[PDB]
From a paper:
Full-length GRP78 consists of two major functional domains, an ATPase domain and a protein/peptide-binding domain. First, there is evidence for the relocation of GRP78 from the ER to the cell surface in numerous cancer cells, where it has roles in promoting cell proliferation and metastasis (and references therein). Third, engineered agents that fuse a cytotoxic agent (e.g., a apoptosis-inducing peptide or taxol) with a peptide specific for the protein/peptide-binding domain of GRP78 can bind to cell-surface GRP78, become internalized, and cause cancer cell death. This finding raises the possibility that, similar to the protein/peptide binding domain, the ATPase domain of cell-surface GRP78 can be developed as a novel functional receptor for delivering ATP analogs across the cell membrane. Therefore, we studied the ability of GRP78ATPase to interact with three ATP analogs (i.e., 7-deazaATP, AMPPCP and 2’-deoxyATP) and the known substrate/product (i.e., ATP and ADP) by using surface plasmon resonance and x-ray crystallography.
To assess the effect of nucleobase modifications on GRP78ATPase binding, we performed SPR and crystallographic experiments with 7-deazaATP, which has the nitrogen at the 7-position replaced with a carbon. SPR measurement showed that the 7-deazaATP affinity for GRP78ATPase, regardless of Mg++ concentration, closely resembles that of ATP (i.e., the Kd values in the low micromolar to high nanomolar ranges). For crystallography, soaking with 7-deazaATP resulted in electron density corresponding to 7-deazaATP, but no density corresponding to Pi and Mg++ at the active site; this will hereafter be called the metal-free 7-deazaATP structure. Absence of bound Pi and Mg++ at the active site of GRP78ATPase is likely to be the consequence of excess 7-deazaATP binding to the emptied active site, similar to the metal-free ATP structure (see above). By examining both structures, we noticed that the atom at 7-position, whether the nitrogen in ATP (N7) or the carbon in 7-deazaATP (C7), makes no significant contact with GRP78ATPase and is exposed to the protein surface. This finding explains how GRP78ATPase tolerates carbon substitution at N7 of the adenine base of ATP. Moreover, various additional substitutions at the solvent-exposed C7 of 7-deazaATP would unlikely affect the binding affinity to GRP78ATPase. On the contrary, the 7-deazaATP structure reveals that the C7 of the nucleobase is surface-exposed, allowing various substitutions at this position. Thus, 7-substitution may be key to conferring the discriminative binding of ATP analogs to cell-surface GRP78 over the purinergic receptors.
Residue numbers in the entry: 27 to 407
Write the structure that this text describes.
């Protein structure tokens, strides 16, 4: 099996880790990033871009970019969830072999269709390449994570994505479990209840797990399938679009690429505001050959999103109800997902649990890959 890698295949961002020289190493991609966008795009010359290069490609044709394949993976075309999601996806989705295939122009007017697992395979291929560059050798085997609520077809389609990518997915493990393993919560005595609060780019998952004898049970799951960091970005986008209109008289949404530029800068500023109190947003040739320069405080970022932040507590309360537990029954709280880097989110979860500190010390957008890599280390032997 060689050196088995651990992969978090995320809706919006993916992460790969390996066990080397006695510990888990989270691997940076060829752009220097320890997470990679689950994104595909095409150049006009017909080059396929994957990851950062695909997300960062300026385009007036969002219909030929592909993302959010995890929303479609392992589902039938006629699945009501698919039919709802296709309303919001800018790329074409068509019924083929009972499934939602993605249809795009890949260069020079050539049209191709891809199954969701074929798009996910492209992302896994990039994750494989990232690991191989670090290791200085090929890898053939992986542990891959999925949401705990994933069903038989979604799990199998994830394994199939691996196969297409040249990875033998040896184990599929649940995301909240992988996070708990990252924090060593499996190597604990007695029965314990663990609440995993996972707030990512596109989705919010809460899971109640019990751990006993090093065996995990997923007791209940809840969340919101379309709440995450992208929604916080959009609140900030709406803020600056409106300010630019009141300031200049003009609506920037007429230019795809301007919106794209602002989105990239807003996301970067949001990330800055998890560790500083103000951030500068600056864009040359933003709109009509005019420059954009604005600032955003942490207080304003929180004010713009407070309702969304506060909405994350309801699914936590539902998971407790469904597990027949009260707050005091929770022995461990694990924060997962990039958006839990937000100070206000950390504050809100602590307050919900009457001052209880969550687990700490692993970057939350890496914790799932980390636990996958822990398991991969044992399988590497
Ligand atoms: N320092 C920070 N402060 C605030 N948010 C942060 C960061 C760093 C990253 N992010 C935001 O985290 C979101 C991505 O989360 P993720 O867990 O990496 O994504 P993923 O595993 O795909 O989650 P999901 O889309 O499957 O729910 C994205 O929205 C990132 O913008």
């Amino acid at each position: 099996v060689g050196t088995v890698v651990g992969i978090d295949l995320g809706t919006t961002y993916s992460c790969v880790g390996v066990f080397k020289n006695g510990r888990v190493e989270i691997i940076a991609n060829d752009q220097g990033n320890r997470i990679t966008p689950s994104y595909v795009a095409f150049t006009p010359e017909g080059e396929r871009l994957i990851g950062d290069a695909a997300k960062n490609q300026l385009t007036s044709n969002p219909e030929n970019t592909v993302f959010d394949a995890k929303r479609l993976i392992g589902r039938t075309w006629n699945d009501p969830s698919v039919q709802q999601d296709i309303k919001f996806l800018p790329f074409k989705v068509v019924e083929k072999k009972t499934k939602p295939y993605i249809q795009v122009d890949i260069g020079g007017g050539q049209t191709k269709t891809f199954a969701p697992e074929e798009i996910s395979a492209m992302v896994l291929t990039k994750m494989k390449e990232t690991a191989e560059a670090y290791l200085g050798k090929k890898v053939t085997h992986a542990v891959v994570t999925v949401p705990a609520y994933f069903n038989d077809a979604q799990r199998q389609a994830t394994k199939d994505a691996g196969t297409i990518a040249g990875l033998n997915v040896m184990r599929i493990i649940n995301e909240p479990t992988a996070a708990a393993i990252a924090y060593g919560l499996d190597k604990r005595e007695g029965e314990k209840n663990i609440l995993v609060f996972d707030l990512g780019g596109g989705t919010f998952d809460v899971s109640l797990l019990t751990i006993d004898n090093g065996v995990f049970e997923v007791v209940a799951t809840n969340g919101d399938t379309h709440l995450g960091g992208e929604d916080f970005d959009q609140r900030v986008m709406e803020h600056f679009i409106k300010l630019y209109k009141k300031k200049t008289g003009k609506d920037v949404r007429k230019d795809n690429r301007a919106v794209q530029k602002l989105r990239r800068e807003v996301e970067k500023a949001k990330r800055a505001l998890s560790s500083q109190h103000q951030a500068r947003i600056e864009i040359e040739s933003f709109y009509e050959g005019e420059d954009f320069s604005e600032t955003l405080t942490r207080a304003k970022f929180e004010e713009l999103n407070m309702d969304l932040f506060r909405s994350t507590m309801k699914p936590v309360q539902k998971v407790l109800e469904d597990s027949d537990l009260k707050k005091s029954d929770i022995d461990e709280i694990v924060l997962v997902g990039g958006s839990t880097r937000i100070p206000k989110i950390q504050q809100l979860v602590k307050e919900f649990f009457n001052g209880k500190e969550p687990s700490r010390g692993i970057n939350p957008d890496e914790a799932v890959a980390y636990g996958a890599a822990v398991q991969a280390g044992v399988l590497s032997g």
